[PDB]
Design a protein around this ligand. Structure first.
Ligand SMILES: [Fe+2]
Ligand SMILES: [Fe+2]
Ligand SMILES: [Fe+2]
Ligand SMILES: [Fe+2]
Lengths: 287, 287
């Protein structure tokens, strides 16, 4: 049986990613959020609700990426150095998920936090999109998987990492770029710094497997990716209408969604699908 | 679909272990090992070979614990906070494995390192024990597992963490407790500080599942654990004879093996199997 040997390269890139992943290492203890109370308490009812909801949503998605997505993809790779990077990424998903609880503990009462988690567990849209993504991961729960299965699990992973979070991320970034909830904003920026590299790394791996597919499998996977994209888009349009209509930001978030979906596509070596618009400069500022 | 909520306990212990795991965080870059060259050159060739070999052995076992053991156990837990801790542990298995390469890069030439990993990959006793352990993990590569299967994968995990490493750990500790290879020794001590807690944590989880088994499944799992224990032992005794006969330390290491096997059992809430015997104070000093 092979042990990992980092003195002999298995590829051109895993070492650089391992180094960057660990250079970016953080834990929630390192950001105090209590100074955010002062801006929190001046937001409207509707603004507090939107924030809590989107954070609740992100928590779920990181829960799944750490508990299913990373582990199941890594177990089937034969590249042991690439494997190592994914296992580190997986741990960091759990830091991410935990960091949202760190934000809640300072902003919300014990009863308000039970409220948010009851809403997230009962949410039909969060269930659907998490369900769609997680369906590709769960196919990997068997001894030998095909390369088409592995590839599609990786496509779902990058969709999740580079695309699905950003209807959520939008709002902590909008608030931070106005000087509100900046301590929480720093956390979301640390999360996002991780996800950016997650997405790129899994996308490189996906492209290696794509190259190992027959021409006809290549065409199938292309079709399926495009369908998956539009399926998810529909659900993100519903999500975003639900969350943001109360605070008049629907179209701003939608632009951001499309922008991020194109980044997801690009990480997978695919062409952009949405025409590029101006992202709201106040979110850019929060970035 | 549930998101992890750390403001509401899922158990009595996961939070404390999550905190201790992340408080013990380290990477190889924090320990310079070049100062070890001076003592290295003064060891006999038999001593160097024994060190390189055991390190090679440890690298393999960590490779498998990070790439199969932690991921496969964590996917089938329903306790999301417990799941978090395992994912962090999994990442740390990768740090550990990488750390042995950091040591080799200082102490051995590129051609000498290719040598050790050739020996590792071809080793019939490393293949057997890693094979045995890993057979319980691979059982989890299906959509639904039984509690008996999960429990046994956890037993194997503890046996790996609390028992199978220590025929290897012995020798870096022996050398360090004499002032030799002390920088490498600090690395092993960091590794061992992690593995102590790994073993205790996985053992708590196993005991929970044991309580959920019928009386008859409890009896089966007991018979199988005892057999697995003895199967491994006969392999470790062959291993220790191979490695350590050249430097006269066979029986010392064997006493340490049995000692650590009793710790493994204890972590699982089972009774000790081996009579207690004086462990070498020099290794205790390296601890
Ligand atoms: Fe994440
Ligand atoms: Fe991620
Ligand atoms: Fe380890
Ligand atoms: Fe471990």
């Amino acid at each position: 049986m092979r042990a990992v040997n980092w003195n002999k390269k298995e590829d051109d890139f895993s070492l650089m990613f391992w180094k960057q992943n660990i250079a970016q290492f953080w834990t929630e203890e390192e950001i105090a959020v209590s100074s955010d109370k002062n801006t929190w308490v001046q937001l409207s009812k509707e603004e507090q609700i939107a924030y809590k909801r989107v954070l609740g949503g992100l928590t779920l998605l990181d829960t799944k990426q750490g508990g299913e997505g990373m582990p199941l993809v890594l177990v089937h790779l034969e590249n042991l150095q690439a494997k190592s990077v994914l296992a580190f990424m997986g741990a960091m998903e759990e830091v991410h998920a935990k960091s949202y609880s760190h934000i809640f503990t300072t902003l919300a009462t014990e009863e308000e936090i039970d409220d948010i988690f009851d809403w997230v567990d009962n949410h039909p849209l969060l269930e659907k999109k998490a369900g769609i993504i997680t369906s590709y991961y769960r196919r990997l729960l068997k001894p030998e998987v095909t390369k088409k299965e592995l590839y599609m699990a990786m496509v779902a992973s990058v969709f999740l990492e580079s695309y699905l979070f950003y209807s959520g991320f939008f709002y902590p970034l909008y608030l931070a770029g106005q000087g509100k909830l900046t301590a929480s904003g720093e956390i979301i920026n640390l999360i996002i710094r991780d996800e950016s590299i997650h997405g790129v790394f899994v996308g490189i791996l996906a492209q290696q497997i794509f190259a190992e597919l027959s021409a006809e499998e290549q065409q199938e996977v292309q079709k399926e990716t495009q369908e998956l994209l539009m399926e998810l888009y529909e659900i993100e349009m519903a999500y975003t209408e639900e969350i943001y209509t109360s605070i008049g930001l629907v179209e701003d978030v939608n632009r951001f969604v499309r922008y991020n979906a194109n980044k997801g596509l690009m990480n997978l070596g695919l062409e952009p699908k949405f025409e590029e618009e101006e992202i709201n400069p106040i979110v850019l500022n929060g970035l």
